Amino acid sequence: MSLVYMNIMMAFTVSLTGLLMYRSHLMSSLLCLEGMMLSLFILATLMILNSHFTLASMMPIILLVFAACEAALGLSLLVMVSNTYGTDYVQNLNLLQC
Amino acid sequence: VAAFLKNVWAKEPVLVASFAIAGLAVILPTLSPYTKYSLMINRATPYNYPVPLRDDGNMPDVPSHPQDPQGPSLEWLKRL
Amino acid sequence: MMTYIVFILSIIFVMGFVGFSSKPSPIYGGLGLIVSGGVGCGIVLNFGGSFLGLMVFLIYLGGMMVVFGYTTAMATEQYNKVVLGTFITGLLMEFLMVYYVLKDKEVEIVFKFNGMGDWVIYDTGDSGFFSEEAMGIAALYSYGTWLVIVTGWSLLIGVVVIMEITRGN
Amino acid sequence: DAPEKNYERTMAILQIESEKAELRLKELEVRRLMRAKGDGPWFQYPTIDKALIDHSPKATPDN
Amino acid sequence: MNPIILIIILMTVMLGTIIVMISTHWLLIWIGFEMNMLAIIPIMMKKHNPRATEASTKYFLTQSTASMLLMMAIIINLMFSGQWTVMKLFNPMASMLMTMALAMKLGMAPFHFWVPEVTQGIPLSSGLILLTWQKLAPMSVLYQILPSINLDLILTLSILSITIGGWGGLNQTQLRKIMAYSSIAHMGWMTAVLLYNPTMTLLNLIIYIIMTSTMFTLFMANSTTTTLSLSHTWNKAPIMTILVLITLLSMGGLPPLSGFMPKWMIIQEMTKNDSIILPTLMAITALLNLYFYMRLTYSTALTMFPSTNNMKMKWQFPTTKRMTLLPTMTVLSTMLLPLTPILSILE
Amino acid sequence: MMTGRQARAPLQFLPDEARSLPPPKLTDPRLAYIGFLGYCSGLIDNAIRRRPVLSAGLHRQFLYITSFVFVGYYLLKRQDYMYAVRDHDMFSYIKSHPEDFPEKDKKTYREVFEEFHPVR
Amino acid sequence: AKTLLHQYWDIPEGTECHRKTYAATSIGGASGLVVSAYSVALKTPTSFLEGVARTGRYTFTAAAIGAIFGLTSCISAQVREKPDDPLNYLIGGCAGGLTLGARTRSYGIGAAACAYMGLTAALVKMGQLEGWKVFAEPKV
Amino acid sequence: PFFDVQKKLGVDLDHWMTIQSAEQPHRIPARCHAFEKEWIECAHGIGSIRAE
Amino acid sequence: IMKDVPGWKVGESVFHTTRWVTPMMGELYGLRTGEEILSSTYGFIWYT
């Protein structure tokens, strides 16, 4: 198929493995999540513009709005974690092991 | 309804103007005589091609030419 | 080179995702995602999605990454090996993919992909006196009634949800 | 009870349960043929409704 | 929380589940999951302690990852089909991604690793919502995509969910983690029969929701979050020990109870399709679930653990808790096995 | 299994062709068992709130019995309808496909050979 | 790794011992790599050296299990001259169980893995004989 | 649990964005309008198993 | 051009139908110069 679709899929998998392998921060996890969303936006837009399928032109707007509201919810969770512990480190969020 | 309105126009005239402008925006197209003409102009704007019809023999209201009398006219749009 | 401009922007897009996905810091992660959003927006702009590209700039980079950097300025304190190693690993993998698909004109990682430029797959028609993408986005109001209902309800609930959980009581 | 009552009641029970057993075997065979061939009233997974198609003349004629 | 805000947020959770159930478009499916997650996050943070914030953060991360994989599967479906109908998928890669995403939304193993922690971190009513109501939407999407679901993938997920939900609860003394590992095992049981007969999937889902609602309602009525606090029920409310006895003997699949009905109908439909080894391994693995159920019954009803002196003050006070539908949910989770052919209403 | 039948007329709890079927009698043992479940629900409801179990709230026990019988009557109607649909589709598929359901020649046991395995 | 199992099961029993031993060794080594990946996933080792040490230990353990399994099975099929017989895989599963016990450095685990893995390999042989489907295709 | 509320109430919530051959704004044709119309009018009513 | 290739069908339709299919950009401007390619494939997009 289209050569640019390979790169946008590989970008989604790169941001996936970034999100699927944490280093320290929850903010970097949310950045990898929104990079995944960015690659989803670009790939959906390239398909819908390529197809000349008219009514799905409003679909990437809905994706962007819903997932940025999702991102605001994630930043509020990060803010409550940082208000609890002082950092946004993922190793401070291990009380639920026992 | 009269003393409260004067009191809130003294205290918060910004919000009184806001709810007045918003309320007129809501209820005024239902009382406007020109709201029909918006619909009529938007459906009379020819973005596409008026694809012709095969004259089977009996379509008296469909013209054979643009300048023929039968057909949807726009005298109301020129005149208003 | 100029015919392959969307491919070159896509390679810069993958390089930017490798740049911040290796996660040097949330600050430089945000910077890399900003540059990635810009070049992916250029990818979208070169197919005719002008409104959707400016939605990237105005909404994604204009609001959301501003809020991510705003929150990162309130989380971390200002003043490696795994980051740079994973960066050059992803760069080697991506340039090996580029070299393979440019020497063979067919590659199969998960799906089959063409090696020519993506200019071939466009349409040879005109739209008239409108952008088709603009009219399909304008149809969010006349056709997309239920979509606007659920999106506005989700945003109002999002306002209520953020005020509930950040209150702390 | 009489031996007649037990005997003929047993024959009624055997008729009912034999009919049910033959109907269960036919039920399994009908379900096997309908999942295999897909030409009965069962396992009709939904396709797209063709009433959604706009047959109007579009902007360009090559369609 | 403001009760008006609580009512609107619970209506928004229900509305997201309804939008997933009734819509024919993949974007509306994704919208419904986004609405469901976005509304259920304050239900988890109702008490505002660090464990609820940790549980809500882990739940956000897992459901967000699942939502993005779901949208990627939808996007590959739009590649290889050019359309949006919620039906079978037209690519096995999109089928694999959507099966992984729905397994993450269910908390099936190996994506089960959030369910005991997130269930432990949140209150019992929110844990009830998470373990009963949130299972309805992804099982509906799995119900509509089953012509495209890979057999080996969903059966691997099912047997791994049953085995891990069996060996998980054997070490646990917290009641919420026991209910979470029971959730993992029962979601394995539900998806194991999905490609064979999804009416038995709906039967297992309904009977499991009734039994889980019974157990969480008993835990809310007794205010017990640990095994050892559930043990003090005999000196306070002795009927509740009988109810947790019959409900935990139900959830272990013991006849003549109604929890025998789902796994018996699942073995009944999988052996029609010439699978003998797989439901036998499933049935032998369910003995671990019944083992920690029997551990709970021994600690609560069949013995009397020693109590404290302050229970004498609570003898003088009755329960003012609105135990909504607890007798109805107790009767329907124990004495429904004579009504086993009622499952035809779900066809 | 039958997802294509109940898709042309969706969300009908009891369709119009269900009224061609005989309804359950009020002396149905299934309906009587659901009434017994209503009685047990009333007894457990009086027991969990420390009321006299057989005595307190005869209006409440009567509403439990009434509510379970009222739900169970329509549930038994839908149950009988779905099994009637199942048999109707089975018989139509057997009648419309003769080549897949041949009339088997029932051999009498004078021709049927069975190997005798002795027990000794 | 499905074709690993295919290239195991294409060869008859008691004919080509080296290739069967190599194929079972590769299947066991792949299983050991999977268990090693999950074991360094869910439990962080003390270093990268400890990680590759645990990976090599689990992989060589399961590879030795598969190697002595396939070797014992094919040599028993040769000396007993019975191809369709699960006693061969019973002795091979007990040899793999003693291999697991020798790697875990205990006798009781060796005898337990002998009995259980021998019964398991006999069950796998009988499923190869009568065509027992564990991931059975839905038919009705 | 595909509760088809849209067909029961007769309302159209999302059937319009579902396919490319639907009623588009200003009658814009998609690039695969004819092919999708042929595939849909082929596969309609015969179910997935006969449609594959 | 396509004479030396064995088994080539000149003008073979990649579609099974005999309906007219709208020509693709590569199906028209494929064997031509890259300037004509760019002017047909990014001319309107890049125009000012």
Ligand SMILES: CCCCCCCCCCCCCCCCCC(=O)OC[C@H](COP(=O)(O)OCCN)OC(=O)CCCCCCCCCCCCCCCCC
């Ligand atoms: C119906 C059409 C659609 C209407 C909705 C669209 C509105 C568009 C404008 C958007 C406004 C967004 C924010 C609105 C918030 C209103 C509530 C509010 O502000 O209440 C608090 C305020 C007193 O403020 P305080 O708490 O003291 O805070 C410090 C500020 N000095 O309390 C007040 O100041 C009292 C405000 C309420 C009384 C205002 C009455 C206005 C009447 C105007 C004439 C009639 C117009 C018809 C529609 C009426 C609708 C109410």
